[PDB]
Paper text:
For example, density for the ClpS NTE was present in both the ClpA D1 and D2 rings in classes I and II, but only in the D1 ring of class III. Loss of D2 pore-1 loop engagement with the ClpS NTE is a major feature distinguishing our class-III structures from classes I and II. Most surprisingly, the D2 pore-1 loops in class III were rotated ~90° compared to their orientation in classes I and II, and the key Tyr540 side chains were tucked in and turned away from the channel. In both class-III subclasses, at least four of the six pore-1 loops were convincingly in the tucked conformation. Three additional features of the class-III D2 ring are noteworthy. Coincident with the pore-1-loop rotation, the ClpA channel in the D2 ring of class III was ~2 Å wider than in classes I and II. Second the D2 rigid-body interface between the small AAA+ domain of subunit E and its neighboring large AAA+ domain in subunit F was broken in class III. Finally, the D2 ring contained ADP in three adjacent subunits in class III, whereas classes I and II contained no more than two ADPs in the D2 ring. Moreover, the portion of the ClpS NTE in the D1 ring of class-III structures is bound in the same fashion as our class-I and class-II structures.
Residue numbers in the entry:
A (entry chain C): 570 to 749
B (entry chain D): 380 to 748
C (entry chain E): 570 to 748
D (entry chain H), E (entry chain I), F (entry chain J): 2 to 192
Amino acid sequence: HPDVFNILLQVMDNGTLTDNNGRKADFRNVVLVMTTNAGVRETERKSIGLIHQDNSTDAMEEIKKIFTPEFRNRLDNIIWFDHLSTDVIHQVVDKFIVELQVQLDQKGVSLEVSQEARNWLAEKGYDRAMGARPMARVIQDNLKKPLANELLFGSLVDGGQVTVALDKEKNELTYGFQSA
Amino acid sequence: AAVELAVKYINDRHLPDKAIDVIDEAGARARLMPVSKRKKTVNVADIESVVARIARIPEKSVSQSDRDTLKNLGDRLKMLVFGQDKAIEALTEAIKMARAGLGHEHKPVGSFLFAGPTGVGKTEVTVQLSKALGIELLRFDMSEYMERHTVSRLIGAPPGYVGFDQGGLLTDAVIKHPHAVLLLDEIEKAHPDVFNILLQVMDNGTLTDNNGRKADFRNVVLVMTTNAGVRETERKSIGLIHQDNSTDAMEEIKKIFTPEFRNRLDNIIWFDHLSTDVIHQVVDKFIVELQVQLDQKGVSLEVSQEARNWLAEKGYDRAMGARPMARVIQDNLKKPLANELLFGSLVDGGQVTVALDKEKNELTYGFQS
Amino acid sequence: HPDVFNILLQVMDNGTLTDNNGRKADFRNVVLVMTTNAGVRETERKSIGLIHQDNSTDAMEEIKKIFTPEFRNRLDNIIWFDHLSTDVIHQVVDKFIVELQVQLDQKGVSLEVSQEARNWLAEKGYDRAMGARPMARVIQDNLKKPLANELLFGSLVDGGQVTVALDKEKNELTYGFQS
Amino acid sequence: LVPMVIEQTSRGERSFDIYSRLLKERVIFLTGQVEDHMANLIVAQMLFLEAENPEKDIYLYINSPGGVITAGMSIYDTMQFIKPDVSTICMGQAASMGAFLLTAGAKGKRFCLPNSRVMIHQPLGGYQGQATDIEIHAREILKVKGRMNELMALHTGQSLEQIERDTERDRFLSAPEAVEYGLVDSILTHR
Amino acid sequence: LVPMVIEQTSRGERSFDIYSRLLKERVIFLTGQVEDHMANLIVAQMLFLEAENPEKDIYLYINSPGGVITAGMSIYDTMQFIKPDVSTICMGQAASMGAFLLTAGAKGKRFCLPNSRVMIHQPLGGYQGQATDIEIHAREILKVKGRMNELMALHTGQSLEQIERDTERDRFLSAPEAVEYGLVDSILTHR
Amino acid sequence: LVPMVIEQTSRGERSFDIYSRLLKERVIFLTGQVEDHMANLIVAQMLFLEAENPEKDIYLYINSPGGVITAGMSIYDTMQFIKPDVSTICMGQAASMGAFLLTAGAKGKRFCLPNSRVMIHQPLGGYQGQATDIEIHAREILKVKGRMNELMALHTGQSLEQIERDTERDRFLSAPEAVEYGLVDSILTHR
Ligand SMILES: Nc1ncnc2c1ncn2[C@@H]1O[C@H](COP(=O)(O)OP(=O)(O)O)[C@@H](O)[C@H]1O
């Protein structure tokens, strides 16, 4: 509700918010970070024109409409996050893979993914509009699914090393369960 | 394990107390459970079982006891629901990953938007999944939550409800049953403000009530059913050349659901119209239910393969899926049996047989008690 | 309103309705019947053209667009009430007149309405647009009202033995007064 | 000025012009000299009705004194292409192009009022310029004349030789005479 | 006049124009002499359709006797620029500019009705002025003629010399002849 | 007729004409002979867009044969006055005062389609009356000519002498040639 914005005017301009009882809280050491998806539809949609338009500015105008000027002036700065480029996506895939390894370590299985396989995952799941969340889903559908069946139904009940490779001819991933 | 597991699965309790609770219960359970053949030591498996009971969630020992149940989960759901295998695989694989330890740390077991035509099994696979797993089914009909003010009931109570029982229906339901299937039928009908409530459920795995109780959704399967794109697909073009209206369904889905909500979804399954081959399986299923109903009254029914095919042709409608099969089953079989069941040979003895003649093109019912 | 149909979907599909209050209403024994006049308008009206187009399937088309497929799928069957033919119309007047005769029987009055009078009563009583709803007044006004007025205060105070016959010139019903 | 008409609906009253109201009943109107813009409208109306109910039959009321043949071909081709049978009813008069569309109606659904007239004749297009250009344009109209006669003969059922002799000059046919010639199956009467 | 039409949407009943209703289905109509205003309108329609669904292909019904070349070239560029394949159908007749847009359709999606006609001729333009101005003005006519022939040859696939010989004078090509020439892929029959 | 397009929004359905819908997307169409009334309409559109989003970029599809020089300066003044970068695209022909507005777009955002043609020439105007008035009017027509050459030189980057020499006689520049001249940054040539 817009009332919440009015509640934060003293939080950012004076640092103190008072309860109905009358006690005052101190916000001088609390890092305040807000997140908003305003103008997400504007970015997702495409302009009706020969030349595509960057709708990053449309989000800012929406921010002005939603938030009152007093609220926005108090803010230190309005950071506009940018879409994930293909280069950082490779780093993003590495992050999910290590998260998978931590889950796998408890089970006793070690996962090894070739560099070519990692690139293949990025191309299949890359979606600038959808960000990094599709990358998790492609990894989940491709890597976590085979491992899950094997861990439960065989070849991985007991901890064993795993290796992943890409077949260029078939353009499909391969796996070596190698139990124990 | 007691400390690490308590943090993960035991909420609203602080760490030095949670672990002591797990540790104390493990000692109590092992000491008095086996009268003879008692293990003096407390292994890690005992701790996992204790947390499971406290949190009402399965443990991590699925690789031995329940390995058979998960392996046959997809096969059993195929017998109950024909076609739509992509939905069954999505649900069973999502479950397997969670039990195997690959599930998301802070997200539900699964979040799937099942969109398709009527009578295609959108709300049937969810009801059968819970029965297969033997877990409580949380069914919420969004037709009630059309307005903004009704949404507050999910996370609380109406403004100034001094009366007790002011706990959110969704928050209290999930707390009572941490392991359950959450079905939000006709999610499109719900006010857009309901999608904002699910953002923390799908992405953070928890929803907080106005009072402040935290509901855990990390172990609940979230399934939503919508008929958003059926109208667009069924729409017929007006032009010399017919148009391939294949992607129109997704475009309608994109408009009704904001990108943030759709991104959180684990997978969007598009159910498809039942094929003629699938209808034969459906006829057999309905007949099986009829046999069970007759078994209560002591009547036995056997139908010929030829009669089954005739029933399929009469009831095969692409737009209406499998629901019309019930109507022909009702008109053709239940009507004669009902009259005889009340008064006639079917009072007792059963031994019913059904057949048809190709020339007549009409079913024949014979009763010999 | 469309929102009402959404409420019935769970009723027919699940058989149980939950009120906002919180109580669970389980009504699986109640039969559900709805009455609509959507198709009659299309079928009764003729096509706007020199050629009369076929309206046999027009009635179903309206119901398909007016009612969502999901709503129609849950319904057991859709039954059409057809216009009352002359043969069945005779039975309707027979029921109304016989009903009045039963009421008069306790009082002791008797009627001898002719079969020809039945035909004339049917045309005025039954209308294609309003059906048999106007037929209520025709039987009561044409038969009960003239005789009832005479019964309370008339040439014949009591004894009945009344008879009725169609009058071609006046299009009125004869009243017999035998004490 | 087009008068509006109210059509009762379950939701409420709906206001539509007289032409649009009849279009809902599949009653299209062809009027005036044929042109690229009226034909585009007529074909557009046919395509709209096809998707609604392809089984149902469209009805085209032809009251035109003739027009450009090229524009009419779009109407003719559209009628044949669509699954729905097009019923052509000649109101008042059907000239060379109007008669072509009239006879092009589906068999059994073509009708003429008892007092209408039907005139058929060869195209009267002309061109001027260099001798070489005139030859190409002159040659083309003979090709078009062949197509008009061959498609007219197919629908009417008369031989190509019969059509060309009659179409040498303007020939006005009455409604009964049209039935004998084969342009229409019957004369529209109130059953 | 334009007959309004009813469309049943998920939201409820909606009233659209005859052309507007067809625009929702990606059907764009090109009719009459090409001009800047109508060309600009077609351009606007194509851009709107691309935004709604770029995957879905656009349909264009061309029934035109030819017009300004500059206006038409804007349409051609837009058709090639946008990702959707702009299917082209020849209703009734297509002139040199009309046929240039017809052949510009994507491969496998260009059609011509059976009784449709086509015409292709060199661009005809006349300028009056000083000899110096005529030289500069004349050069543009040669350049555009070559560009049109080159583009026409590219879509049809025929030799440039053959296109130059045929384009020197007006040439009329029937529907079956257009398919062989390469202007259209195939005739539309019972789709 | 102008088609009506439905814009789907979360709040509800909205109906807009094809041109107005494009204006909502910061697309302006400068089509037809330049005039005071049409130029005023374009000026109003730019100001409305500037207020809605000054930081965002405006677009101006120029398909016009040129026109009134003074009316066009109102657009040029407004293009440079408003903070938004008024990108320009050229569809079909661009002529005197059409190209002047096409070359006045922000650097790096001007574009021309592959087949678009650009024409540039000096102002053409005449006055009839007393010799004294002709001298005054003649001086006015010369001063305006120099100002356009100065402005054209600024955007293109060529010296004033180069522009004056070329602009003395009508000069037609192809789309790639315009890039060499500097009227536009580059050709789109994108899918
Ligand atoms: N594939 C199927 N196999 C068996 N029963 C089915 C199937 N599809 C639908 N049904 C039956 O139809 C009903 C489910 O319809 P549902 O898919 O929930 O409809 P909707 O999509 O309109 O919500 C139940 O009665 C169920 O038994």
